[PDB]
């Protein structure tokens, strides 16, 4: 069940120097980088598309601002069951053992994004890596 | 907005085993800040008995108190969003990997760390270890 | 009370350099090594004895071929409630915080074996450490 | 023979979340904590006492302002040849393997203070732990 | 003395899953990613330019082959004295505490490249990140 | 081409302090492979005396032998390019940070690890611990 999924390393990760720590956990679980981009500051449009689902939520504008308040890295990861597994690896701020579980403490500043489904992964990859 | 304070004790087994920084580091990495901290080469047994007052009619009480005064302890007040429950989850238990107790401890009693389990316990415990409120 | 349990570090751990990582996680939870052997290649009979409960499954031959494709280490660990605790440490590939959860991504190539019961434990120890 | 030495964890360590990292390196080399205090803000007189040997240097006021710009932890460590060994552990920003070598990149914001001699040691301990 | 320098993460780093480990050491020393590219397979021309100094050495062709045998990451790092410091961080396979010192064991497969001078850094950055 | 073998001993202090995996991990991370390994809950004192034969007329000899039989040891043969000297550098000494002894040990005698210091010592020591050459 080989899959590709999309990961974003959020600006709080740079602010807090957790970038390598985060990528290390994914690497140590045996997933491979297919492609990767560094954005010293991501175009707002890209963030807006990425989080389009949320444009009606009240928090949507704070969320874009944050995503644009420092660098992000966009990564395409590949491996068996990658979408589901990396999602689990990302976890939530309540569950220790996971990325957000060990390292994050905020509902907004939570370090990493990982596609949550087959469809969102295909969509998300096309946003950040349109050259496909 | 969600900001809380909670009390943590580093227990004597953590010193015996050199896990003090390991334990504090897990809490630090989850973005909690130290707000005050005390090193006790031996904690006054009266502080302990109070801390575990809710356990005074248990079989284990006197061994527990004995263990807690058997080596150094560090009391720490931590601050951050939802600190009481988040630091509690981090503490976990010896059955759940990913947590401090889950990864590092293997005893009912020698379990390395105490964290307040609720707002009331936190206010109460912080009072005990940091009376200069 | 104390128990002893048997652990095998599988060939994928050597291949991926996770031997010390895996043994470290067991060491940190305070379990002690009672017995240990290194097999640059484990005799196939031993492997077949070890997985005899599986001798009818279609994956049996492949499992054994894998277990023989590189070195393994067999270890007897001692500590309170060892069998069950090291089992939980082992986990599965869906559970962050565990050896297999953090480090493994395959159903078969999963780094570590831990006895699953007092009976299997006693049995597996005699297989690998018959001298006792 | 045993010595005691004084260590200060500086405000940049708290700012960058390296407190446990730094204390860990000292812990792993087998030194024990005899005394420890946390100062959300250290009294300026203490800092000026501590760096009194520097009171004539042009950086003196700035150093003190830095040392007062965040929390510090003062620690008395005990162990064999503590003063010299923890000094080496501390190192400088040019020496990989040391606290400052791996973690620091500035001449002044350099994470840790360690007493440099038996005299300065005895002195610095009385400054921070006069009750003794 | 703020500087930018060029780092390559070599294919042996991917092969051995040390990518995050390597970037972590640089990150933990407080250097910042200015820009970054992932090459699933770097154009041979780029490698040839990068190592042009060596085109007369006997090992030059083996070296290019290796640099092209798997992915590389090219990174521009920024910080005080970045060229010299990251160079020291890279070290050599003889000196523990450094990247090649802790993790590498071959004169050719040594995990990381870091510009060794002001001129080579400007040259190297122009190769991998010509958009400047 | 440059391939060698060298003998490593994990000493009893490493078990007492739970540093076994930490020590082996540093060697593993530097790309050296285990070629054979033995666990000794107590090493035969005759093996020790031989291992440290070159030290038989020293003040410290009997304490050293006592220490080496005071808890488990693991003997390991490691293989890799230039293994003898590279694993030696990794061992280092209690004065140099970055090394095993530099980071983890603080005693002349309780220094966690032994590594062969030359081709001759390696052949000789490997003979001792792995006589089935
Ligand atoms: N600033 C802010 N961001 C939020 C809030 N709630 C959610 N978000 C962000 O928007 C995303 C919404 O959560 P969700 O759609 O379930 O994505 P997930 O967290 O990756 O599972 C999260 O990743 C958060 O980063 C909020 O209350 N404030
Ligand atoms: N020695 C011993 N100590 C116990 C026992 N049960 C509880 N304790 C001590 O008291 C605590 C019991 O848990 P609880 O009071 O609910 O707080 P918790 O430790 O944070 O879960 C443990 O941390 C132990 O240190 C026991 O059966 N034996
Ligand atoms: N290749 C393969 N191996 C399997 C499969 N099911 C079980 N195994 C092997 O058996 C183990 C998983 O189930 P089991 O033997 O009952 O328990 P466990 O090994 O302790 O998790 C793994 O170690 C696998 O190596 C399968 O469907 N395919
Ligand atoms: N800002 C600044 N601080 C300095 C300078 N020289 C020394 N210091 C301070 O003094 C220390 C370095 O020299 P010194 O005090 O003699 O010994 P050390 O602190 O143990 O390394 C550092 O902790 C600095 O904070 C300088 O040129 N500028
Ligand atoms: N395959 C191979 N590569 C080499 C050899 N010697 C040097 N190299 C490679 O080419 C570079 C030459 O070394 P040098 O110019 O001093 O660069 P440095 O290692 O980064 O300091 C090294 O980075 C090696 O990766 C060799 O004998 N064989
Ligand atoms: N207790 C004690 N042991 C020593 C002393 N000197 C040497 N040794 C032991 O023998 C070794 C001396 O170093 P050497 O024989 O050259 O081998 P090395 O340990 O790898 O440096 C140390 O590892 C110690 O374990 C000493 O003064 N006291
Ligand atoms: Mg989602
Ligand atoms: Mg408790
Ligand atoms: Mg099974
Ligand atoms: Mg000084
Ligand atoms: Mg060079
Ligand atoms: Mg020795």
Beta-strand content of chain A: 15-25%
Oligomer: homohexamer
Share of helical residues of chain A: 40-55%
CATH architecture of chain A: 2-Layer Sandwich
Pfam families (chains B, F): NDK (PF00334)
EC number (chains B, F): 2.7.4.6
Catalytic activity (chains B, F): a 2'-deoxyribonucleoside 5'-diphosphate + ATP = a 2'-deoxyribonucleoside 5'-triphosphate + ADP; a ribonucleoside 5'-diphosphate + ATP = a ribonucleoside 5'-triphosphate + ADP
InterPro entries (chains B, F): NDK-like_dom (IPR034907), NDK-like_dom_sf (IPR036850), Nucleoside_diP_kinase (IPR001564), Nucleoside_diP_kinase_AS (IPR023005)
In words, what does this structure look like?
- The structure is a homohexamer.
- Chain A is built from seven helices and four strands, in the order βααβααβααβα.
- A four-stranded antiparallel sheet of chain A has the order 2-3-1-4, with helices on both faces.
- Chain A has one domain: Nucleoside diphosphate kinase-like domain (Alpha-Beta Plaits, 2-Layer Sandwich).
- Chain A is α+β, with helices and mostly antiparallel strands.
- The radius of gyration of chain A is 14 Å and the shape is globular.
- Chains A and E meet through helix 2 and strand 2 of A and helix 2 and strand 2 of E.
- The complex binds guanosine-5'-diphosphate (GDP) (6 copies) and magnesium ion (6 copies).
- One guanosine-5'-diphosphate binds next to helix 4 of chain E.
- The PDB classes it as transferase.
- The entry lists the keywords phosphotransferase nucleotide binding, ATP-binding, Kinase, Magnesium, Metal-binding, Nucleotide metabolism, Nucleotide-binding, Phosphoprotein.
- It forms a hexameric assembly.
């Amino acid at each position: 069940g080989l899959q590709r999924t999309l990961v974003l390393i959020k600006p709080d990760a740079f602010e807090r120097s957790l970038v390598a720590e985060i990528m290390g956990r994914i690497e140590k679980k045996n997933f491979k980088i297919v492609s990767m981009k560094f954005w010293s500051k991501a175009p707002r449009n890209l963030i807006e598309q990425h989080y389009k689902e949320h444009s009606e939520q009240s928090y949507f504008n704070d969320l874009c601002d944050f995503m644009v308040s420092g660098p992000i890295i966009s990564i395409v990861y590949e491996g068996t069951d990658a979408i589901s597994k990396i999602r689990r690896l990302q976890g939530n701020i309540l569950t220790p053992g996971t990325i957000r579980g060990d390292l994050a403490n905020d509902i907004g500043e939570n370090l990493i994004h990982a596609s949550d489904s087959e469809d969102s992964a295909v969509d998300e990859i096309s946003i950040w890596f349109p050259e496909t």
